[PDB]
Every structure is written in structure tokens, then in C-alpha cells.
Amino acid sequence: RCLWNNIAALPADPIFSASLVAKKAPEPKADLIIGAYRDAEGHPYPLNVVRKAEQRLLYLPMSGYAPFIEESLKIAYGDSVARENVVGIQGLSGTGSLSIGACFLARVLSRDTPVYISDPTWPNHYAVMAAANLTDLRKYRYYDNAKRCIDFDGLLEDLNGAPEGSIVILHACAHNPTGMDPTHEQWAKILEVFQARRLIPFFDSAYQGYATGSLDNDAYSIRLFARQGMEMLLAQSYSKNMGLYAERVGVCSIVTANPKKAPLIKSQLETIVRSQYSTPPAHGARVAYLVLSDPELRAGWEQELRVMSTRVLEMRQALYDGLKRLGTPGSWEHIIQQVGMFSYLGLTKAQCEKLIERRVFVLPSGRANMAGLTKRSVELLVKGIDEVVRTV
Amino acid sequence: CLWNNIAALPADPIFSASLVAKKAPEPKADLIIGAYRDAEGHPYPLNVVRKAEQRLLELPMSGYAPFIEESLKIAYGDSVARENVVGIQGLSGTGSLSIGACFLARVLSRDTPVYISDPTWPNHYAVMAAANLTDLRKYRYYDNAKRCIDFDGLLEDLNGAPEGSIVILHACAHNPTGMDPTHEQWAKILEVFQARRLIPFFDSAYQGYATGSLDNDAYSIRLFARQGMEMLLAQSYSKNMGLYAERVGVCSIVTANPKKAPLIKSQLETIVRSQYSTPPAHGARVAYLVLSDPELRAGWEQELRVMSTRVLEMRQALYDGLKRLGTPGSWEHIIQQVGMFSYLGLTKAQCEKLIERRVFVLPSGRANMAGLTKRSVELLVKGIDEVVRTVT
Numbered sequence: 180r181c182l183w184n185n186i187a188a189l190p191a192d193p194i195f196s197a198s199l200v201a202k203k204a205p206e207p208k209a210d211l212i213i214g215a216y217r218d219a220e221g222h223p224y225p226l227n228v229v230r231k232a233e234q235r236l237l238y239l240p241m242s243g244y245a246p247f248i249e250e251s252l253k254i255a256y257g258d259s260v261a262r263e264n265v266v267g268i269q270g271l272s273g274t275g276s277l278s279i280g281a282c283f284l285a286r287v288l289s290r291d292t293p294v295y296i297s298d299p300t301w302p303n304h305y306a307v308m309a310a311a312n313l314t315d316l317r318k319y320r321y322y323d324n325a326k327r328c329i330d331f332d333g334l335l336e337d338l339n340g341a342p343e344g345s346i347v348i349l350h351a352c353a354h355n356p357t358g359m360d361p362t363h364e365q366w367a368k369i370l371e372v373f374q375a376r377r378l379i380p381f382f383d384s385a386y387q388g389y390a391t392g393s394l395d396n397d398a399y400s401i402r403l404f405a406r407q408g409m410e411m412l413l414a415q416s417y418s419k420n421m422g423l424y425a426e427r428v429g430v431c432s433i434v435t436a437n438p439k440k441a442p443l444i445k446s447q448l449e450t451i452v453r454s455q456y457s458t459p460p461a462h463g464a465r466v467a468y469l470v471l472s473d474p475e476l477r478a479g480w481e482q483e484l485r486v487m488s489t490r491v492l493e494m495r496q497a498l499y500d501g502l503k504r505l506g507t508p509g510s511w512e513h514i515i516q517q518v519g520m521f522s523y524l525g526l527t528k529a530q531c532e533k534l535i536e537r538r539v540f541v542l543p544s545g546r547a548n549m550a551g552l553t554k555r556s557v558e559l560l561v562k563g564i565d566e567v568v569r570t571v
Numbered sequence: 572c573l574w575n576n577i578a579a580l581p582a583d584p585i586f587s588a589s590l591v592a593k594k595a596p597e598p599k600a601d602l603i604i605g606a607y608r609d610a611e612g613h614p615y616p617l618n619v620v621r622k623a624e625q626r627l628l629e630l631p632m633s634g635y636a637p638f639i640e641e642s643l644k645i646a647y648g649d650s651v652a653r654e655n656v657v658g659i660q661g662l663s664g665t666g667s668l669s670i671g672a673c674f675l676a677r678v679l680s681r682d683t684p685v686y687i688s689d690p691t692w693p694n695h696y697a698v699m700a701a702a703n704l705t706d707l708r709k710y711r712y713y714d715n716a717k718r719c720i721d722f723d724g725l726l727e728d729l730n731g732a733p734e735g736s737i738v739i740l741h742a743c744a745h746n747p748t749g750m751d752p753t754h755e756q757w758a759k760i761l762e763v764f765q766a767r768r769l770i771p772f773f774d775s776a777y778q779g780y781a782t783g784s785l786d787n788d789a790y791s792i793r794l795f796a797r798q799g800m801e802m803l804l805a806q807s808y809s810k811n812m813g814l815y816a817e818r819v820g821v822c823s824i825v826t827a828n829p830k831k832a833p834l835i836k837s838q839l840e841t842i843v844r845s846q847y848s849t850p851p852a853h854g855a856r857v858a859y860l861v862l863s864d865p866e867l868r869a870g871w872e873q874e875l876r877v878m879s880t881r882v883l884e885m886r887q888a889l890y891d892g893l894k895r896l897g898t899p900g901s902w903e904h905i906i907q908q909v910g911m912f913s914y915l916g917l918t919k920a921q922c923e924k925l926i927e928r929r930v931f932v933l934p935s936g937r938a939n940m941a942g943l944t945k946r947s948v949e950l951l952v953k954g955i956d957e958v959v960r961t962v963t
């Protein structure tokens with residue numbers, strides 16, 4: 180007898196292997212899997228202001244460190260709704276905050292509630308929903324691989340098919356892995372569907388401040404839905420926009436249309452966090468609270484974020500410029516319409532396989548970490564893409 | 572309003588009371604938190620951990636393999652061959668427990684009955700429910716009025732369990748009562764497991780705390796594993812190393828068929844992705860140094876021995892004091908109990924009256940015994956003698 184005889188084969192981790200290849204590859208190379216950042220997830224090192232806050236930092240309820248929760252709600256919702264319509268609790272980073280929200284949705288609605296997920300998405304979305312036992316997982320078309328844009332007609336078709344009450348996982352800004360976000364107009368069309376079909380937004384905000392370098396503008400989609408009266412969930416991470424991965428800083432929040440339901444939501448969320456931590460991680464919350472609340476730290480963080488987003492846009496611009504100059508076949512407009520640190524380069528699996536023999540390392544999906552590119556590496560990437568497009 | 576029928580829940584039974592204890596005037600005995608960091612009883616790092624942190628200054632998805640190996644070694648020793656064990660990192664005890672719960676939910680069924688001791692560490696229910704184990708059941712464990720393990724009711728409830736039921740076992744230092752099965756009792760418990768094909772899911776948060784001997788505290792884990800039975804184990808280092816801030820834990824699965832280990836491992840790795848996007852390396856490295864380095868290991872073991880001796884001495888002082896006063900009732904449970912927490916044996920009304928003498932215990936008679944001192948134990952002796960003789 181063996182309890183586990185049916186455990187079921189799973190495909191192996193694509194990224195981990197390929198990541199080691201790029202790392203333990205010679206030296207004359209362009210690593211766009213990990214590179215300058217710390218993992219293939221793209222966690223950066225603590226930002227300058229975060230380090231200042233760590234230094235300057237020299238009895239919690241289960242929901243966690245309330246000053247941090249309040250600042251986290253502020254940066255996300257920005258007065259789009261009244262405070263009494265908002266409930267927040269600490270999560271262990273983005274992943275923990277997603278799982279809190281997913282377990283909350285599973286407990287208060289139903290584990291059989293359909294969840295729509297973008298095609299493609301951040302891969303561990305599936306792992307989070309499965310751990311919550313959200314078993315009815317569906318795709319909405321998102322990236323159009325042929326036209327190198329958001330398949331917005333497909334997206335709207337799939338969401339217009341969503342059963343009422345379906346959960347939709349939404350990337351707040353800097354869609355991962357494509358780097359391509361809806362326009363404001365597209366968000367308006369999306370919102371109309373949510374409203375007509377009474378779908379449940381579940382916003383994933385891991386990059387507020389990365390997309391445009393503007394916290395407010397990056398929050399457009401969250402605030403559009405909240406302000407127009409949508410009830411919804413939000414998972415916030417600070418692992419990327421502050422570099423606080425090790426301290427596991429995040430918030431899961433719920434928007435209620437009825438403020439009298441808020442204490443009930445809060446208690447339900449508090450028993451859920453108990454499945455995640457026995458004591459709220461106070462230290463990372465105190466650090467983030469200080470970056471958020473202190474005017475001088477807050478100003479320096481907003482500025483470093485603005486610096487990063489213009490830099491990455493610059494590199495994208497150089498990439499596109501190099502591809503136009505070489506006459507590389509295809510549309511390359513998507514390269515300068517993308518934001519955040521990941522971009523879908525627009526290549527086929529086969530073209531990506533050949534790039535990795537140039538020691539230009541991207542994922543086989545065409546995902547490139549575009550932060551960390553230098554004028555030298557972007558020109559290697561120009562020549563590499565131009566070669567594989569023409570010969571593969 | 573989606574959140575209209577959210578079930579009302581009871582208030583946190585510790586948080587408010589712990590505040591009353593911390594805010595009360597200085598001549599007092601705080602047996603809720605005291606000198607420990609929080610209400611769960613997480614200590615500051617032991618000295619060997621501090622020394623490990625210092626020496627450290629001189630992946631894949633499952634985590635830091637040498638940590639996992641030493642963690643399994645200390646738990647299982649000679650009771651099971653290495654090829655029958657699969658282990659992954661979890662975020663402390665809670666995370667490790669969640670991984671195991673989600674694994675069982677995934678590979679067996681979410682409807683699989685889960686038996687949980689009455690009383691238990693409260694967050695067990697929240698871990699199991701977040702994994703969406705929906706059939707949670709009590710087994711009788713402690714009879715508060717009799718001040719002993721209700722061993723006839725315990726065995727009765729497990730004999731009533733359906734075959735394949737999951738049972739959450741406290742490996743040692745049962746929380747919150749402090750009362751563990753004897754070795755003979757553990758074997759009578761194992762008999763029911765063996766006869767009824769029950770699935771042990773051990774929770775080991777106090778290995779080395781209970782008795783100061785890592786090997787002796789693993790008795791029950793090793794009694795069951797040396798049978799060849801399949802089981803799960805969640806290990807925390809938050810309490811016996813004081814490493815809560817580093818979220819160090821291990822979930823292991825025992826498989827009777829080594830060939831299934833690769834599949835088990837892949838399943839676990841999918842599951843940890845609901846919990847963290849990159850494993851908590853630093854605490855694994857710290858723990859690994861404590862576990863494997865001859866000097867640090869030996870010093871860690873000495874600190875554990877001293878800690879357990881110290882708390883036994885405080886229990887013995889309390890018992891001796893109540894005996895000298897002739898306080899009514901049986902007080903043997905005081906010196907039979909182990910670990911940081913004790914059920915002192917008081918009624919709710921006796922506990923309420925102790926609070927007016929500023930001796931703060933939970934109304935469930937639970938006291939953190941480990942922060943007691945010669946000074947404070949003498950106040951507890953007199954408070955207990957008082958409320959026993961004068962209430963109800």
C-alpha cells in the first residue's frame with residue numbers, strides 16, 4: 180500500500196533550469212531571465228529609500244501593523260472610495276496577499292466560483308487558486324502573439340461569456356509577462372462588462388510605480404473600478420516596487436459597497452491570515468510604512484521609481500530604434516508600448532531557442548527582463564532579434 | 572453586496588486580554604505574553620542562532636537542500652530511510668502546515684476528515700480550512716476539569732474515525748495544555764492508526780523544548796515513522812530557535828514507495844508557489860548552521876536543556892508552593908506538563924478573579940510558564956491558592 184500512488188506527473192519548472200543556464204553561461208552574454216535582479220521573478224534589491232528607512236528604524240492585531248495598512252490603502256485607492264468601504268490585512272508579500280484574497284473568495288462565495296485568468300499571466304496565479312481549491316480556472320485571451328498586441332476583441336468576448344459572479348484576475352499595471360496594459364479607454368470597456376455581468380475584479384498590483392513611474396496613474400485601473408462602485412479584491416506587493424522581498428510585505432484588501440459589512444469582512448480575513456502567519460510580519464510593514472509616510476523618504480522613492488521607468492523606456496526605445504534601422508521584418512511598435520520590467524519580445528519559441536545559443540537569454544515565451552539592459556546589451560539584443568527573425 | 576451573508580465570527584480570544592495584561596500596573600504576573608515576543612510565545616533568537624547569523628556573514632523552488640536534510644535528520648533519525656522522505660521549505664510552522672494540508676487536499680480529497688485535538692493550537696482550524704479541508708473534527712484530548720488527558724475519549728474518537736482520516740498530532744509540548752501522551756499512550760494511539768489506516772500529520776513546533784532533548788522529543792514522530800507508515804510532518808524553528816522573523820519550517824511527506832518521491836516532490840513544489848515565489852533562504856542557512864556545525868549544534872542543545880530545566884524548576888516551585896499551602900485539588904498536572912504553556916486547571920471564574928490580583932492567564936486556564944521567575948511563581952502560588960479557596 181502507498182497513499183501517493185496516484186500523485187500525478189507534473190511538467191518540470193521551465194524557468195529554474197533555463198535560469199541556471201543563463202547564470203552559469205560563459206560571460207560574453209545578455210541575461211534577460213534574471214540578470215541584475217535577484218531571481219527570475221525579478222525581485223530587485225532594496226531601493227535607496229528603503230535602505231534609509233531600514234536604518235532610520237534603529238503588540239499587533241492579526242490584521243497587522245495598522246499604519247502600514249492605511250498607507251497601503253491610500254497609495255492603491257487614493258480616496259477613490261471612503262475609508263469605511265475598505266478592509267485591509269497584511270499578506271506575506273504579493274503571493275501571500277493573493278492567497279488570502281483567493282481563500283477569502285473561496286470561503287465567502289464558493290470554491291467552484293469560476294476564475295478567469297489572463298492568457299498569458301504570472302504563472303503562480305494558478306498555484307494560488309489551486310491552493311485555495313479554486314478549481315474552475317478559465318482563460319481570457321490577452322496577448323495576441325501574431326499581432327503583438329492585446330487581443331482586446333478576444334478579451335471582451337471571453338469576459339462577455341463569463342458567468343455572472345465569476346472572479347477575474349486583473350493585472351493592475353505592468354501586465355506580467357507581456358508588459359502590455361489596456362489603455363484607459365480599454366479599461367472603460369472592460370469595466371462595462373464587469374458591471375453588466377456582475378463579475379468580481381481581483382486586482383493583482385505588484386508593480387505600482389513601475390509602469391509609468393507615477394503611483395497615481397499606475398493605480399488608474401484599481402481606482403476606476405473602486406470609484407465606480409465595484410466590489411473587489413486587491414493584492415498588493417512591495418517586493419518589486421520597494422525591493423522588500425525578504426521582509427514579505429503586502430496587503431490584501433476588500434472593497435465593500437456596504438460599510439456595515441466591513442467588520443464581518445475583517446474578521447473573516449483575520450482567520451484566513453492565520454493560515455499564513457501566526458504573528459503578522461511587523462518589520463517589513465514598519466519599513467514600508469516609513470517609505471510611504473515620511474515625506475522625504477516618500478519623495479525619494481517616487482523619484483527612484485520615475486528614474487527606473489524612464490530608463491527602461493529609453494532601453495526599449497533603443498531596441499525599437501535598432502530594429503527599425505536594420506529593417507527587421509515585423510511590427511516592433513509593441514516594444515515601446517510595453518512598460519514595467521518584463522516585455523514579450525514577440526518571438527516564436529524557435530526564435531527564442533536560437534537566441535539562447537547566442538547567449539542572449541530570454542524565456543522561450545519571449546519574456547525578457549528589460550530592466551538592466553545597457554546601451555551595449557540592447558545593441559546585442561537588436562542584432563540578435565534581427566538575426567533570429569530573418570533565419571528562423 | 573457580495574459580502575452580505577459573511578458569517579459573523581468570535582472575537583480574538585487573546586488579543587484584548589493580552590493588552591489588559593500589558594497595560595496593567597507593574598506588580599503583576601503576565602502569563603499571556605510576558606517576556607516573549609508575542610501571543611504565540613515566539614522567543615528572541617537563542618544564542619547559537621545569533622552566533623549562526625554572525626558566522627553566515629563570514630534555488631530550487633523547494634529551498635535550501637542541506638537545511639531540509641538536517642531538518643529531516645533531527646526529526647526522523649534512524650526511523651525511516653532517507654529515500655522514503657520528501658521535504659520542502661515552508662514559511663515557519665504555519666506555512667509548513669499549510670503546505671501539508673494543501674498537499675493532502677490535493678492528492679487525497681478535500682473532504683477527507685481531519686481530526687484535531689480538543690483543545691489545540693487554534694490556528695490548526697484556519698490552516699485546514701484555507702486548504703479547504705471541509706470536514707474538520709475534534710478528538711477528545713484534554714479534560715480541563717479532570718486536569719488530565721482524556722485518554723479513553725481520545726482513543727474512542729480515533730477508533731470512530733473513518734479509515735484514511737487525517738489526524739493532526741502535536742509531536743511534543745501539546746499546545747495549549749502542556750500535557751503530552753506518555754510513551755505507552757503514544758503506542759496505544761499508534762495502534763489505532765495502524766488498525767484503522769489513519770494518516771498522521773505531525774505538528775512539531777517544540778522539538779527540544781519539551782524535555783531539553785531533541786531525540787527524546789522526537790519519540791512520537793519516530794515511533795510512527797519506524798513503522799513504515801506514510802505520514803506528514805510540519806516542523807517549525809520559530810520556537811526552538813527563536814527564528815520567527817526568518818520563517819523557517821519544513822513540511823515532509825513519508826512515502827512507502829521511494830519511486831513516488833519525485834512526483835510527491837513536484838506536487839509540493841507547485842504548492843509552495845501559493846506560499847512564496849522564492850524560498851526563504853537566509854533562515855534556512857541560519858538553521859542549517861545551527862543544526863550541522865558541531866560547536867553551534869552543541870551550544871543550541873545546551874540552551875535547550877537549560878531552558879527546559881528552568882521551566883520544570885518553575886513548575887516544581889508552583890507545585891511545591893501549592894502543596895505547602897494545602898491548596899485543594901490535584902496539582903500533579905503542573906509537574907507532568909511540559910513546554911511553554913500549561914493548563915493550570917482553573918475555572919473561568921477563578922481565572923477572572925486572578926486578573927484582579929493582576930495575575931493574567933487566559934480564561935481557558937492557559938498560562939505561559941516559561942517566563943515565570945522565582946519572584947513571579949510565588950505570586951502565582953498565592954493567587955491560585957486564593958481563587959481556588961474563595962471562588963464558586
Ligand SMILES: *Cc1c(COP(=O)(O)O)cnc(C)c1O
Nearest residue numbers: 272273274301355385416418848
Ligand atoms: C511578483 C509578482 C507577484 C508575487 O509577488 P511576490 O511578492 O513576489 O510574492 C504576484 N503577481 C504578479 C503579477 C507579480 O509580478
Ligand SMILES: *Cc1c(COP(=O)(O)O)cnc(C)c1O
Nearest residue numbers: 457663664665692746776807809
Ligand atoms: C507555535 C505553533 C505553530 C506555528 O509555528 P509558527 O512558526 O509560529 O508559524 C504551529 N503549531 C503548533 C502546535 C504551535 O505551538
